[PDB]
């Protein structure tokens, strides 16, 4: 989604469902490659080491001054008729330049966006319909014309655009954590190894303080850590090679 071959429209975004895996979010925040990285309700460095039920990456393109519309507590045509986020949206919105990426000879006028809809979209509701609606009580009955506006507007894409008119490849990471199992998490830091010394440890399954040693003790590969007769910390399996 961050290096997608083609980015879709603001109303027909490509939603990538992330589940049952790990992924670092601070690696991209401190990458110095993307322009904008703003999270609402939680810092991007805090959620890097926190699990979530599901994470959706909505890939689409909007202008520089249009990024303010895609946020909790903000209105707009793209925020009400194309992609409505909830007022309590606790996700993130990452964006970066796209002039040298999605542009072509003569300009890329393939992107589109809806100006109006019969009703406002609900939170996280996609709509790819091109139905021509009527302005007043006199409907045109189908084709465009006589106060029957076409819902989608052409998207200007030129290399000499301004900072507010520049399109940005936006990737909205909608985070959600409920009572269901937390299937999405992030990776941990590097590892160390010191033996024959009382030191603190935090393995994949448990933590504490003890002395690391080696012996000929066996261990079942389908388990993580062992316990003694009195349920005390005993020999454990290395999270690394067996």
């Amino acid at each position, epitope marked *: 989604v961050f290096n997608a071959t083609r980015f879709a429209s603001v109303y027909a975004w490509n939603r990538k469902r992330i589940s049952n895996c790990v992924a670092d979010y601070s690696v991209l925040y401190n990458s110095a490659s993307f322009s904008t990285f703003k999270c609402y309700g939680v810092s991007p460095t805090k959620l890097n080491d926190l699990c979530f039920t599901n994470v959706y990456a909505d890939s689409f393109v909007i*202008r520089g*001054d*249009e990024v303010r519309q895609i946020a909790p507590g903000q209105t707009g*045509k793209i925020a009400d008729y194309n992609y409505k986020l909830p007022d309590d949206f606790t996700g993130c919105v990452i964006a970066w330049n796209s002039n040298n990426l999605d542009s072509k000879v*003569g*300009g890329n006028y393939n992107y589109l966006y809806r*100006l*109006f809809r019969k009703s406002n979209l609900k939170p996280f509701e996609r709509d790819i319909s091109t139905e021509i*609606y009527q*302005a*007043g009580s006199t409907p*045109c009955n*189908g*084709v*465009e*014309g*006589f*106060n029957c*506006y*076409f*819902p*989608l*507007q*052409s*998207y*200007g*894409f*030129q290399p*000499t*655009n*301004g900072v*507010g*008119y520049q*399109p940005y490849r936006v990737v909205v990471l909608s985070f959600e954590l409920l009572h269901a199992p937390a299937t999405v998490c992030g990776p941990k830091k590097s590892t160390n190894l010191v033996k024959n010394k009382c030191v603190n440890f935090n393995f994949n399954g448990l933590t504490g303080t003890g002395v690391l040693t080696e012996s000929n003790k066996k261990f079942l590969p389908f388990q993580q850590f062992g316990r003694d007769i009195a349920d005390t910390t005993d020999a454990v399996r290395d999270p690394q090679t067996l």
Partner: antibody
Amino acid sequence: QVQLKQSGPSLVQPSQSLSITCTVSGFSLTSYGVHWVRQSPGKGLEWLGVMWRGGNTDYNAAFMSRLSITKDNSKSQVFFKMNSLQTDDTAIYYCAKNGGAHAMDFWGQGTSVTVSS
Amino acid sequence: NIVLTQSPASLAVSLGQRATISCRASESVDSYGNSFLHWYQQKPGQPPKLLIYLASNLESGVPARFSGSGSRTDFTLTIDPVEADDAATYYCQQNNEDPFTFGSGTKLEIKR
């Protein structure tokens, strides 16, 4: 890339009729309705009419009884039927690509129509 | 009969100031969620071109100096800062009611 130039007329006489064909390039004719305007007869721009997406036509209060638009979907060409042209109707006719709210995003070169024998 | 009484006929504004081109209308408003007009710009040696649609949206290729707003009857085009390459005739287009007439056209001139 986008071309909306006009051609077709040979001699436009007063109190006569003649058709103008505007080229359609850069987009499908069945997707956008070609708009029509003239080149500032006195005051600023003036509206002539607009063709639907394969339906009907709308015209201005002054040009509804004199001008008519005809959409040829078999030839992919937009025809403009003129009727009862006067000496004051001399102006350059322009075509344009339909926007969202009946806007004119793109413009062509058009053709210079002069009403005189 | 929709006659957009676009006023004034011309403007004498110096560089760096704010030019105000008004556009009055009579019919009509509440088409969908707004009632704004489309603004254009025609140079003495070039056909017209669309700058801002509905007076409140963004458009690429044109400079950022073009902005505007409008009430239910009077619509305003805002050019700020006025540079040395924006001397041309500007128009407004009716789109919320048939006929889709245009204004008389204001000649924005640089006050040298």
